[PDB]
């Protein structure tokens, strides 16, 4: 619906982002605070994440996906397939199950919504069955991130979307740790949304550090474009 691209209006300029993650992995508890801004016109995310509570029990790269696909650039001809924006400002619940091959898994539950002029992401994560000797707990993954595809279809029974994709986490010996992602997003609002044709997001990510941040942290720079229509 032409009108339903009022999401255009809410994501027109630069939008401040807040992310908050209460986390638990084989009993190890921790919190992450994210702040930064989005430019949906450009697919653009700039965010800085800081460990705020506990010792960080897993590699930063494993948490990227968990830590706002509303900031994805939908080309003009595809804009009527942008669910994430069509759900705002009252937002959607994102839920994921994530299996790391030969190791444990993450189950996540997130509210993404506007809280004023600001786009917020509240995240409860539990992970279980992680091999102590494995790459995750064993901290054996590079601080880099591969370009990925993200397959979307409508889940009309939930008035929302089914999402799935494989993440490739590089280990320094040239091998790869796989995270297999299963993702349902449901809206929170009682109103209509854009239910898309089958399509995907092409997602670039760049992980850096603040030279002056004394705390365990992650500065993430991410670019997402939709395609396949």
Is residue 54 included in any domain, yes or no?
yes
Report the number of distinct structural domains present in the chain. 1
Q: What share of the chain is helix, strand, coil (3-state, %, to 5)?
A: 10, 50, 40
Asked if residue 209 is part of any domain, the answer here is: yes
Which range of residues forms the domain containing residue 37? 7-227
Determined by which method? X-ray
- Give the DSSP letter of residue 11: T
Residue 14 is assigned to a structural domain of this protein: yes
Residue 72 inside a domain? The answer is yes
Tokens of 223: 């670019």
Residue 7 DSSP SS3: helix
Q: What is the DSSP letter of 73?
A: B
Question: Does the bond joining 176 to the residue before it have cis omega, within 30 degrees of 0?
Answer: no
Q: What is the CATH number of the domain that holds 115?
A: 2.40.155.10
SS3 51: strand
Entry resolution in angstroms?
A: 2.8
Q: Does residue 2 form part of some domain? A: no
155 part of a folded domain: yes
Is residue 1 in some structural domain?
no
């Amino acid at each position: 619906d032409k009108m339903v691209s009022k999401g255009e209006e809410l994501f027109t300029g630069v939008v401040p982002i807040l992310v908050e993650l209460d986390g638990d992995v084989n009993g190890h508890k921790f919190s992450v605070s994210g702040e930064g801004e989005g430019d949906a016109t450009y697919g653009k995310l700039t965010l800085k994440f800081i460990l705020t509570t506990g010792k960080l029990p897993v590699p930063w790269p494993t948490l990227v996906t968990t830590l706002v696909q509303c900031f994805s650039r939908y080309p003009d001809h595809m804009k009527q397939h942008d669910f994430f924006k069509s759900a705002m400002p009252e937002g959607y619940v994102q839920e994921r199950t994530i299996f790391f091959k030969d190791d444990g898994n993450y189950k996540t539950r997130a509210e993404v919504k506007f809280e004023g002029d600001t786009l917020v992401n509240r995240i409860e994560l539990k992970g279980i069955d992680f091999k102590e000797d494995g790459n995750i707990l064993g901290h054996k993954l590079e601080y880099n991130y591969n370009c990925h595809n993200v397959y979307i279809m409508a889940d009309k029974q939930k008035n929302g979307i089914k999402v799935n994709f494989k993440i490739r986490h590089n280990i320094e010996d040239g091998s790869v740790q796989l995270a297999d992602h299963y993702q349902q997003n449901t809206p929170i609002g009682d109103g209509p949304v854009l239910l898309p044709d089958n399509h995907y997001l092409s997602t670039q990510s760049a992980l850096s550090k603040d030279p002056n941040e004394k705390r365990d942290h992650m500065v993430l720079l991410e670019f997402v474009t939709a395609a396949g229509i």
